[PDB]
Design a protein around this motif. Structure first.
Motif, mmCIF file in Angstrom:
data_model
loop_
_atom_site.group_PDB
_atom_site.id
_atom_site.type_symbol
_atom_site.label_atom_id
_atom_site.label_comp_id
_atom_site.label_asym_id
_atom_site.label_seq_id
_atom_site.Cartn_x
_atom_site.Cartn_y
_atom_site.Cartn_z
ATOM 1 N N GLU A 101 0.841 -1.205 0.000
ATOM 2 C CA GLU A 101 0.000 0.000 0.000
ATOM 3 C C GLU A 101 0.882 1.264 0.000
ATOM 4 N N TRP A 102 0.317 2.390 0.434
ATOM 5 C CA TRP A 102 1.096 3.656 0.398
ATOM 6 C C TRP A 102 2.245 3.561 1.406
ATOM 7 N N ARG A 103 2.395 2.399 2.051
ATOM 8 C CA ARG A 103 3.523 2.185 2.995
ATOM 9 C C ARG A 103 4.715 1.632 2.208
ATOM 10 N N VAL C 68 -8.787 4.308 -15.351
ATOM 11 C CA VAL C 68 -8.317 5.434 -14.520
ATOM 12 C C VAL C 68 -6.918 5.154 -13.988
ATOM 13 N N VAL C 69 -6.014 6.124 -14.149
ATOM 14 C CA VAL C 69 -4.660 6.133 -13.563
ATOM 15 C C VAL C 69 -4.420 7.437 -12.793
ATOM 16 N N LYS C 70 -3.269 7.529 -12.127
ATOM 17 C CA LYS C 70 -2.806 8.753 -11.461
ATOM 18 C C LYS C 70 -2.218 9.761 -12.464
ATOM 19 N N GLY C 71 -1.917 10.984 -12.024
ATOM 20 C CA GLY C 71 -1.460 12.073 -12.906
ATOM 21 C C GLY C 71 -0.235 11.723 -13.759
ATOM 22 N N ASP C 72 0.882 11.437 -13.091
ATOM 23 C CA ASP C 72 2.134 11.060 -13.751
ATOM 24 C C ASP C 72 2.168 9.612 -14.254
ATOM 25 N N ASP C 73 1.216 8.762 -13.829
ATOM 26 C CA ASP C 73 1.043 7.407 -14.363
ATOM 27 C C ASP C 73 0.535 7.383 -15.819
ATOM 28 N N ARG C 119 -8.219 1.313 -8.125
ATOM 29 C CA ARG C 119 -7.120 0.447 -7.705
ATOM 30 C C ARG C 119 -6.168 0.203 -8.859
ATOM 31 N N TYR C 120 -5.038 -0.408 -8.526
ATOM 32 C CA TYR C 120 -4.061 -0.890 -9.485
ATOM 33 C C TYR C 120 -3.295 -2.092 -8.909
ATOM 34 N N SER C 161 -4.763 -0.185 -3.612
ATOM 35 C CA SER C 161 -5.695 0.859 -4.023
ATOM 36 C C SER C 161 -5.024 2.216 -4.192
ATOM 37 N N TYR C 162 -5.592 3.057 -5.062
ATOM 38 C CA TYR C 162 -5.321 4.485 -4.998
ATOM 39 C C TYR C 162 -6.032 5.112 -3.769
ATOM 40 N N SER C 163 -5.774 6.395 -3.517
ATOM 41 C CA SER C 163 -6.295 7.123 -2.355
ATOM 42 C C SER C 163 -6.561 8.573 -2.748
#
Lengths: 119, 107, 188
Positions: A101-103, C68-73, C119-120, C161-163
């Motif tokens: 995760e984000w960890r 869906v991805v993140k900005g820099d992804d 998620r990814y 997951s994304y957040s």
């Protein structure tokens, strides 16, 4: 118990070759996130490279094509075949375990191995 | 490679004083900041994941904040056992990097 | 008959990047004034085909591959890219032909509480094939000690997951993405 074993550091000339060894305890290399971060004596931390669970690699342009983080699936070892060494490459080498995760905190590194580069 | 600059570079705090460090990323990296403590003659030890959560096997006195481009850790009570340097690290891009780190001693 | 680019681009529900969908476009005449003559897209990179002459270019099928991805992804979504999404989630072939259209969606895909719905895949043994889809939930083996599909020492949950939060700068907000895959009865 989670533990790491650094070894393979020895004295070397500039432009030489060296090899690190870690028979991985606490986890096994074959399917983990593993970085390489060295620290010079009395300096800041320096990111070098990182191998991913499927074999992906990233390198900074300052250390690109000089370091080759690789691993056979036949052995429980992260290998580093190191080439074109310089006086700035003096570690205190650490391999990192990435958590989930984000960890993505590289919580467990080890004690480090002494590589000294000089004429 | 993302440049992470910290301030101040070193500071002296008394027995039981409060030490607070700041770390800035040149590009936004969310809560992607693993914060380590390196004691003299010891490897860096993780303190913070997600920028505001205490790492497992760390004392409850460490609790940070800040996210995006700026990151903060407030040691609510720096101790004689906490005489050490700290290093922030980002991982938001394909090239990872570390902060310069702040050398903290007792006063 | 007009093509359902509207049904995929303006889809109310978007799938996650680990569990993307493909739709076959066989029999249609398109009007590419809906893609090229508009400014909702922040990423635009057509490969092997130009952004205007593609109207009178026939291809045997077109696929609308949305996620869906993140900005820099978004920079990982390119033939050859060695990025985390490119290598473990969804890979484009190195001889890819088509277009990619991506847009920021922070106001609909980033909540103050943290959006954990998108998620990814961070963990995928080996690497995916071009256009390969993996939705397996099989527990990730982190080492060689047996995990009996469980969580503990050397044994990790495969999926993450994304957040998505509103506090992120332009680097790491959510982006709705469409990858168009062409295969050699559709024209402009």
């Amino acid at each position: 118990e989670v533990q790491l074993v650094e070894s393979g550091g020895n004295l070397v000339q500039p432009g030489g070759s060296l090899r690190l060894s870690c028979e991985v305890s606490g986890f096994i290399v074959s399917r983990n996130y593993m970085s390489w971060v060295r620290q010079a004596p009395g300096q800041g931390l320096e990111w070098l490279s990182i191998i991913y669970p499927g074999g992906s690699t990233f390198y900074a342009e300052s250390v690109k094509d000089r370091f080759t983080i690789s691993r056979p699936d036949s052995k429980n070892t992260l290998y580093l075949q190191m080439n074109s060494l310089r006086a700035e490459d003096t570690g205190t080498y650490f391999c990192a375990r990435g958590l989930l995760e984000w960890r993505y905190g590289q919580d467990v590194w080890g004690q480090g191995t002494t590589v000294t580069v000089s004429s | 490679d993302i440049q992470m600059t910290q301030s101040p570079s070193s500071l002296s705090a008394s027995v039981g004083d409060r030490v607070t460090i700041t770390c800035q990323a040149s590009q936004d990296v969310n809560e992607d900041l693993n914060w380590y403590q390196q004691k003299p003659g010891k490897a860096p030890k993780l303190l913070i994941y997600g920028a505001f959560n205490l790492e497992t096997g760390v004392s409850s006195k460490f609790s940070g904040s800040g996210s995006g481009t700026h990151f903060t850790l407030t040691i609510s009570s720096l101790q004689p056992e906490d005489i050490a340097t700290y290093y922030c690290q980002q991982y938001g891009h394909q090239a990872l990097s570390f902060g310069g780190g702040t050398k903290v001693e007792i006063k | 008959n007009l093509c359902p680019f509207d049904e995929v681009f303006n889809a109310t529900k978007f799938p996650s990047v680990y569990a993307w969908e493909r739709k076959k476009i066989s029999n249609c005449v398109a009007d590419y004034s809906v893609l090229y003559n508009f400014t909702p897209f922040f990423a635009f990179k057509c490969y092997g085909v130009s952004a205007t002459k593609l109207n009178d270019l026939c291809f045997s099928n077109v696929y609308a591959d949305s996620f869906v991805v993140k900005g820099d992804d978004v920079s990982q979504i390119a033939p050859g890219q060695t990025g985390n999404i490119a290598d473990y989630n969804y890979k484009l072939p190195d001889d890819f032909m088509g277009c990619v259209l991506a847009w920021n969606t922070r106001k609909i895909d980033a909540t103050s509480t943290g959006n954990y719905n998108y998620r990814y895949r961070l963990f995928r043994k080996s690497n995916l094939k071009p256009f390969e889809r993996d939705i397996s939930t099989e527990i990730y083996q982190a080492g060689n000690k047996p995990c009996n599909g469980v969580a503990g020492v050397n044994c990790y949950f495969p999926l993450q997951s994304y957040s998505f939060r509103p506090t992120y700068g332009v680097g790491h907000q959510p982006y709705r993405v469409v990858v168009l895959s062409f295969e050699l009865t559709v024209c402009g």
